UniProtKB/Swiss-Prot annotation:
It is found in: Nucleus; Nucleus speckle; Cytoplasm. Expressed in the hippocampus and the cerebral cortex. It comes from Homo sapiens. This is THO complex subunit 2. The chain holds residues 1000 to 1175 of 1593 of the full protein. Changing W56C: In MRXSK; uncertain significance. It is linked to Intellectual developmental disorder, X-linked, syndromic, Kumar type: A form of intellectual disability, a disorder characterized by significantly below average general intellectual functioning associated with impairments in adaptive behavior and manifested during the developmental period. Intellectual deficiency is the only primary symptom of non-syndromic X-linked forms, while syndromic forms present with associated physical, neurological and/or psychiatric manifestations. MRXSK patients manifest variable degrees of intellectual disability. Belongs to the THOC2 family. Component of the THO subcomplex, which is composed of THOC1, THOC2, THOC3, THOC5, THOC6 and THOC7. The THO subcomplex interacts with DDX39B to form the THO-DDX39B complex which multimerizes into a 28-subunit tetrameric assembly. Component of the transcription/export (TREX) complex at least composed of ALYREF/THOC4, DDX39B, SARNP/CIP29, CHTOP and the THO subcomplex; in the complex interacts with THOC1, THOC3, THOC5, THOC7 and DDX39B. TREX seems to have a dynamic structure involving ATP-dependent remodeling. Interacts with POLDIP3 and ZC3H11A. Component of the THO subcomplex of the TREX complex which is thought to couple mRNA transcription, processing and nuclear export, and which specifically associates with spliced mRNA and not with unspliced pre-mRNA. Required for efficient export of polyadenylated RNA and spliced mRNA. The THOC1-THOC2-THOC3 core complex alone is sufficient to bind export factor NXF1-NXT1 and promote ATPase activity of DDX39B; in the complex THOC2 is the only component that directly interacts with DDX39B. (Microbial infection) The TREX complex is essential for the export of Kaposi's sarcoma-associated herpesvirus (KSHV) intronless mRNAs and infectious virus production.
Length: 119
């Protein structure tokens, strides 16, 4: 569908309340990660890079708001973000790992966060 369209809808998709509603949610998150990787691989270039950085910042803020609430969807989104996708991102990952260690399923989410931080 994105290839047929080839605009602003791929950036308009990048989603807190959209991801707020498990396994099919993980499939949709993997589809969103594949679409984001396809959009990233393929002053307009500087504005597109700034929009990609703003999308990453908004995704990090949405992940922080979902971790503040909601756990398994955040873990599936973390797995998809480790699949597809840095100093502020590293600080957000450290804060998420500290919140995961402050919390079972939280242990599996912390193991996935440690495996993502190892990359």
């Amino acid at each position: 569908v994105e290839l047929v369209h080839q605009l602003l809808c791929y950036d308009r998709v990048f989603i807190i309340y959209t991801v707020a509603s498990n396994e099919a949610s993980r499939y949709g998150r993997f589809l969103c990660c594949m679409l984001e990787t396809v959009t990233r691989w393929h002053q307009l270039d500087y504005e597109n890079f700034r929009h990609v950085v703003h999308k990453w910042h908004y995704k990090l803020t949405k992940a922080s708001v979902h971790c503040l609430e909601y756990t398994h969807i955040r873990n599936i989104l973390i797995v998809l973000t480790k699949i597809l996708p840095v100093l502020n991102l590293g600080q957000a990952l450290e804060r998420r790992v500290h919140k995961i260690c402050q919390e079972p399923d939280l242990y599996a989410l912390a193991m996935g966060y440690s495996g993502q931080l190892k990359s």
